[PDB]
Amino acid sequence: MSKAFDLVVIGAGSGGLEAGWNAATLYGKRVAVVDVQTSHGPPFYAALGGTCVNVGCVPKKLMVTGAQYMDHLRESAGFGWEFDGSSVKANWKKLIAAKNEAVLDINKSYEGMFNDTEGLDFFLGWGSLESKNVVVVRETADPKSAVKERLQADHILLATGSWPQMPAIPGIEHCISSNEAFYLPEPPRRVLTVGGGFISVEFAGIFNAYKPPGGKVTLCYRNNLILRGFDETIREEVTKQLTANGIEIMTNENPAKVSLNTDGSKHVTFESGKTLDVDVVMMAIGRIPRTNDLQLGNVGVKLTPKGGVQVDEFSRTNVPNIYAIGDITDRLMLTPVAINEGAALVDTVFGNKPRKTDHTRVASAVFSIPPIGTCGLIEEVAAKEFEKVAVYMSSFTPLMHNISGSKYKKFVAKIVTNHSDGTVLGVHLLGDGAPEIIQAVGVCLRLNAKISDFYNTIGVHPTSAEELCSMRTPSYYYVKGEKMEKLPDSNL
Amino acid sequence: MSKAFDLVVIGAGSGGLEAGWNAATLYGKRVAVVDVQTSHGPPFYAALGGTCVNVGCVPKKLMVTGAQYMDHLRESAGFGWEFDGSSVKANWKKLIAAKNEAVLDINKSYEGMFNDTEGLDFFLGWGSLESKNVVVVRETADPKSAVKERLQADHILLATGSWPQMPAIPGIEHCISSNEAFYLPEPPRRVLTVGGGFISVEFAGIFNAYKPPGGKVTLCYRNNLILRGFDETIREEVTKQLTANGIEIMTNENPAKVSLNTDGSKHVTFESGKTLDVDVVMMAIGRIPRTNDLQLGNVGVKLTPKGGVQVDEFSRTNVPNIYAIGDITDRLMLTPVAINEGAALVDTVFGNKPRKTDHTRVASAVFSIPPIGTCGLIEEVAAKEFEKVAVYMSSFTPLMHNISGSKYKKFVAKIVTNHSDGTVLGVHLLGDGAPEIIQAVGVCLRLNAKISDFYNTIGVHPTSAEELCSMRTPSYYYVKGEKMEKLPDSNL
Numbered sequence: 001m002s003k004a005f006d007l008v009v010i011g012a013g014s015g016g017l018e019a020g021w022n023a024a025t026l027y028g029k030r031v032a033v034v035d036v037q038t039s040h041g042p043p044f045y046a047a048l049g050g051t052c053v054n055v056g057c058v059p060k061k062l063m064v065t066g067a068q069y070m071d072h073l074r075e076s077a078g079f080g081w082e083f084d085g086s087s088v089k090a091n092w093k094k095l096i097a098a099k100n101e102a103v104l105d106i107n108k109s110y111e112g113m114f115n116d117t118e119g120l121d122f123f124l125g126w127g128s129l130e131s132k133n134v135v136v137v138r139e140t141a142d143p144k145s146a147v148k149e150r151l152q153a154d155h156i157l158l159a160t161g162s163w164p165q166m167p168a169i170p171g172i173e174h175c176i177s178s179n180e181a182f183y184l185p186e187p188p189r190r191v192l193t194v195g196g197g198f199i200s201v202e203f204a205g206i207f208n209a210y211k212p213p214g215g216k217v218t219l220c221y222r223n224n225l226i227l228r229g230f231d232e233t234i235r236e237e238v239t240k241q242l243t244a245n246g247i248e249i250m251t252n253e254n255p256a257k258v259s260l261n262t263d264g265s266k267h268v269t270f271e272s273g274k275t276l277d278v279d280v281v282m283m284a285i286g287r288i289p290r291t292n293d294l295q296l297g298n299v300g301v302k303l304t305p306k307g308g309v310q311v312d313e314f315s316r317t318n319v320p321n322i323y324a325i326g327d328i329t330d331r332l333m334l335t336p337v338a339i340n341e342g343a344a345l346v347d348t349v350f351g352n353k354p355r356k357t358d359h360t361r362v363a364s365a366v367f368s369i370p371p372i373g374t375c376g377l378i379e380e381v382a383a384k385e386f387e388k389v390a391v392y393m394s395s396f397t398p399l400m401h402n403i404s405g406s407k408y409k410k411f412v413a414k415i416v417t418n419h420s421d422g423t424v425l426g427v428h429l430l431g432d433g434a435p436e437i438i439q440a441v442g443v444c445l446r447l448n449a450k451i452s453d454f455y456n457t458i459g460v461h462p463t464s465a466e467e468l469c470s471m472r473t474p475s476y477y478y479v480k481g482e483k484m485e486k487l488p489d490s491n492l
Numbered sequence: 493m494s495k496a497f498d499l500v501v502i503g504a505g506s507g508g509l510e511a512g513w514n515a516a517t518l519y520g521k522r523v524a525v526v527d528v529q530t531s532h533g534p535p536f537y538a539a540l541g542g543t544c545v546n547v548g549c550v551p552k553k554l555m556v557t558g559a560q561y562m563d564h565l566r567e568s569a570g571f572g573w574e575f576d577g578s579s580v581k582a583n584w585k586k587l588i589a590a591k592n593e594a595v596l597d598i599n600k601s602y603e604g605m606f607n608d609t610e611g612l613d614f615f616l617g618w619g620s621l622e623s624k625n626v627v628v629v630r631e632t633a634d635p636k637s638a639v640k641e642r643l644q645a646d647h648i649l650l651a652t653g654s655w656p657q658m659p660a661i662p663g664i665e666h667c668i669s670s671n672e673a674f675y676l677p678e679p680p681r682r683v684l685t686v687g688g689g690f691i692s693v694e695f696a697g698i699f700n701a702y703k704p705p706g707g708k709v710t711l712c713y714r715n716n717l718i719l720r721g722f723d724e725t726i727r728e729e730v731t732k733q734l735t736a737n738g739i740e741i742m743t744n745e746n747p748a749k750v751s752l753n754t755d756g757s758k759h760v761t762f763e764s765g766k767t768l769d770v771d772v773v774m775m776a777i778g779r780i781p782r783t784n785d786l787q788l789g790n791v792g793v794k795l796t797p798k799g800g801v802q803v804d805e806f807s808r809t810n811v812p813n814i815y816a817i818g819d820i821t822d823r824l825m826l827t828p829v830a831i832n833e834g835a836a837l838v839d840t841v842f843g844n845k846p847r848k849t850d851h852t853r854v855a856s857a858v859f860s861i862p863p864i865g866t867c868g869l870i871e872e873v874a875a876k877e878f879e880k881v882a883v884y885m886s887s888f889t890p891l892m893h894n895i896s897g898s899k900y901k902k903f904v905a906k907i908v909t910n911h912s913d914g915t916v917l918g919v920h921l922l923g924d925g926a927p928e929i930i931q932a933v934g935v936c937l938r939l940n941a942k943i944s945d946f947y948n949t950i951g952v953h954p955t956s957a958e959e960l961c962s963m964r965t966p967s968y969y970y971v972k973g974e975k976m977e978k979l980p981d982s983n984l
């Protein structure tokens with residue numbers, strides 16, 4: 001009578017929802033959506049709306065913004081602003097509540113989005129894969145827990161997102177991930193964030209701003225240089241500016257064991273023998289694809305070398321009617337890329353207008369302090385796949401920071417081109433504005449903009465972004481993969 | 493032999509300096525630049541560096557920045573930052589002192605650039621035309637004053653910018669312009685900016701921040717709506733947000749006379765008949781090209797019916813080898829336009845590649861609070877130019893401001909289109925980050941980007957700029973000049 005579902009979706013995240021909505025309202029398809037919670041927060045943290053809405057994008061930006069105010073208050077003095085210095089208090093409990101109310105607002109809107117949209121229905125619980133055309137809902141992630149639904153499905157979309165990777169050292173239970181950090185009752189006086197990724201960096205600034213008096217945020221990384229994958233000079237610069245803002249950046253170090261002290265603080269021993277006492281130890285060493293609770297062995301879905309789900313240019317798996325999008329694919333773990341993959345999967349299946357999503361030349365940010373903006377390739381990657389590579393550099397200390405009192409806040413801007421046709425292959429910014437600036441740059445790369453298109457554009461003065469139009473000559477080259485300043489005389 | 497140059501520049505401003513530097517460092521020409529001061533301030537205000545450096549873009553930017561801190565301190569309470577509100581106060585003298593230092597540093601560096609660059613010589617004095625090939629530098633703007641030098645010039649470039657226009661009302665003596673506003677001893681308790689342009693609006697925000705207790709900023713404009721030439725919706729939103737901050741906006745009002753009071757304050761009487769008692773009256777009703785002291789009649793350089801120096805698309809005047817650029821031409825009074833006009837002039841005259849400054853689709857800004865970023869045409873003009881016009885629009889109060897308490901701060905993001913092909917004709921933004929966002933949008937327009945090229949681009953989450961890659965369907969249309977919420981019929 002009610003049949004199956006033209007599509008069932010496991011995980012109602014960024015991609016899960018964009019697919020179920022573009023199907024119930026765009027194609028009148030029957031759609032089911034399974035997620036494990038309706039409101040943000042413990043015990044599962046991520047809930048209806050995805051990691052982005054509950055324990056990622058939205059709540060992180062709000063907290064970084066709140067953390068920027070530490071700099072604002074300090075820098076106002078240069079512009080003549082005075083107020084009781086010793087009376088300032090960074091009220092973390094107040095910040096978390098403001099955030100929680102923002103998140104729950106989105107939780108309810110989506111909560112209502114399902115209650116007035118025929119063909120779109122929400123099923124609370126855990127989704128496991130039974131047959132190649134049946135999704136199993138259970139009260140908990142345990143495969144032997146009670147069942148509440150068995151959703152007959154014509155198409156099955158896997159969109160469970162990803163999960164924080166934890167290492168195998170003694171005392172790892174005394175550690176937290178990004179998940180639990182959003183819900184600390186109090187701000188930690190001493191915090192150690194492990195790893196070098198954007199999550200560890202972004203939370204180092206947040207903790208650094210709301211820490212009570214006498215606190216130290218120590219970031220450790222097992223290798224030499226943090227923010228692996230981002231442009232090099234931006235990496236060293238960001239390291240320098242994190243230090244300036246009081247964060248201890250402790251590279252070439254790795255926790256080896258963690259114990260509790262008589263007061264509940266964590267005692268951390270490293271692989272190099274050095275010890276550190278902190279009140280919180282946050283692991284941010286990577287995000288793995290979230291596939292364990294899916295029972296993908298019941299149907300034989302294939303996984304890549306990394307624990308991720310294998311897919312093609314259309315998000316299809318070996319099983320004919322099973323697709324995967326979002327962070328479960330282990331590709332570009334970004335929200336708009338999951339929204340793009342989801343929207344594309346639908347109108348290629350339920351709309352016979354096949355259009356895939358482009359994974360190259362994608363804009364992304366890193367709301368650190370200072371923030372990062374990037375798009376395209378970095379210079380050392382362009383080298384390994386491009387004849388002649390040009391690099392445009394420019395690192396001015398912004399206008400206002402001679403007054404502000406923050407001379408260290410050096411704004412950086414790199415452009416990377418194929419020197420043959422001058423086509424821009426990358427753009428890398430560091431400094432306030434980088435996230436908002438890079439967005440419109442993403443459109444340019446989608447239009448094959450050559451460098452001439454940039455410096456021949458009239459600037460908007462005075463801005464930081466004008467520095468992208470002010471670079472007319474390379475600072476060095478990458479020819480044959482090698483880096484020398486000058487570019488040796490032709491010779492074919 | 494001596495005092496015979498390749499180029500003589502009257503006015504060491506934005507366009508002038510670019511012209512000379514390029515001519516000397518890029519083509520090894522003997523260059524001479526004349527200006528009336530080496531450092532900012534009275535009695536001449538403008539100086540080496542131009543109006544932008546000494547009494548223009550640079551100084552106001554720093555002061556707007558300082559005024560933004562009034563909002564920052566207030567908005568920080570929503571994010572958990574506590575402190576004695578009553579203890580806050582802004583020190584206007586520290587702001588000016590700080591701004592003076594920053595401007596002075598630029599003055600100091602531009603000098604020494606002359607000292608270290610051969611073929612580039614500076615001449616302190618007042619320049620004017622004696623003959624087609626001779627620039628005279630006198631001790632004062634008066635023709636009767638002492639000659640300092642006579643400079644033989646194969647080419648002369650007029651780059652003296654513009655000057656504040658002051659209406660000839662009785663009591664005008666008791667008023668100031670933007671020039672003197674940069675050097676007030678104390679912040680006015682009561683102030684009246686006159687004019688609906690970007691200078692009056694920007695200063696309203698600065699005075700509104702630094703006014704002592706019980707103050708009141710009052711902006712008046714003789715017409716019904718401020719910021720003519722900007723997108724209407726933005727015009728009306730900025731008006732609301734200005735009122736939302738404390739600035740009172742008197743429209744359809746124009747001062748008729750000013751008189752002194754016993755205490756020494758001002759008594760304004762408008763045409764309509766109303767009266768306002770204010771401590772300062774800042775005129776910003778426009779700026780006229782500074783042709784007064786050049787002796788253009790001695791040579792016959794023709795002026796425009798509007799009052800600027802007449803120049804073709806290559807900046808050539810009716811008189812051979814005499815050129816003009818910048819505000820003196822009375823076109824787009826923007827620093828990068830003059831700079832680009834200067835660099836183009838040098839390439840053409842001293843190179844083997846003609847270059848002319850594209851004056852359309854120039855991205856400009858306006859540093860109100862919040863700011864405006866725009867580029868390209870606005871609805872009305874597009875409707876006069878194209879057949880079918882589409883208008884993509886997006887307006888909301890960012891989530892960060894629902895928390896900060898500043899709920900009036902509604903973001904705006906229009907996009908004008910020619911529906912006959914999709915090419916973006918203009919972009920108009922309002923809110924935090926707009927000036928930075930618009931810069932790369934200027935690159936996209938030079939590439940004739942289409943509306944599809946924006947929404948088919950993957951966005952950066954979470955940012956204000958996302959709203960540009962999110963408008964897919966027009967909010968309304970403009971067919972044959974008329975506005976309508978939907979189109980006509982069929983149209984295969």
Ligand SMILES: Cc1cc2nc3c(=O)[nH]c(=O)nc-3n(C[C@H](O)[C@H](O)[C@H](O)COP(=O)(O)OP(=O)(O)OC[C@H]3O[C@@H](n4cnc5c(N)ncnc54)[C@H](O)[C@@H]3O)c2cc1C
Pocket residue numbers: 010011012013014015016034035036037044046047048049050051052053055056057060125126127128159160161162178199290293294325326327328333334335336338365952953954
């Ligand atoms: C701290 C942090 C900051 C980030 N910041 C950014 C940023 O600034 N910009 C950006 O673009 N990206 C950011 N990301 C990444 C972004 O949030 C994710 O890439 C995005 O959520 C991916 O979309 P998705 O739908 O695939 O995953 P998700 O949105 O996480 O979808 C997974 C959902 O499925 C549910 N689920 C899981 N297993 C099951 C199951 N068995 N049964 C039922 N439901 C299940 C989960 O509870 C969750 O609701 C950030 C991530 C983190 C952790």
Ligand SMILES: Cc1cc2nc3c(=O)[nH]c(=O)nc-3n(C[C@H](O)[C@H](O)[C@H](O)COP(=O)(O)OP(=O)(O)OC[C@H]3O[C@@H](n4cnc5c(N)ncnc54)[C@H](O)[C@@H]3O)c2cc1C
Pocket residue numbers: 461462502503504505506507508526527528529536538539540541542543544545547548549552617618619620651652653654670691782785786817818819820824825826827828830
């Ligand atoms: C308050 C204000 C704010 C502004 N803000 C912005 C902004 O945010 N962005 C933007 O793009 N533009 C802005 N502008 C516009 C910008 O200042 C001018 O458009 C720009 O400086 C024009 O450059 P120019 O070289 O043509 O003239 P100027 O830069 O003004 O140069 C003219 C120079 O010639 C000198 N001079 C004059 N007469 C003589 C003479 N007889 N002999 C020798 N030297 C002489 C003057 O001393 C002056 O230094 C602003 C302008 C003002 C007034």
Ligand SMILES: c1cc2c(ccn2CCC2CCNCC2)cc1-c1ncc(C2(N3CCCC3)CCCCC2)s1
Pocket residue numbers: 017018021109110112113114116117
């Ligand atoms: C929000 C609230 C909604 C509905 C439908 C009903 N409601 C509220 C129910 C009412 C109940 C009574 N009280 C008032 C609210 C729909 C929404 C939507 N969010 C987002 C939507 C869109 N995607 C969905 C997933 C991310 C964004 C739809 C696709 C285009 C972008 C916005 S659509």
Ligand SMILES: c1cc2c(ccn2CCC2CCNCC2)cc1-c1ncc(C2(N3CCCC3)CCCCC2)s1
Pocket residue numbers: 509510513601602604605606608609
């Ligand atoms: C500043 C200081 C300079 C020079 C040349 C020498 N100085 C100082 C001398 C010392 C500098 C530090 N090293 C030791 C020598 C040149 C500059 C320049 N600013 C800006 C310049 C530019 N246009 C020139 C005219 C207006 C701005 C042209 C170069 C790119 C930035 C803009 S050029």
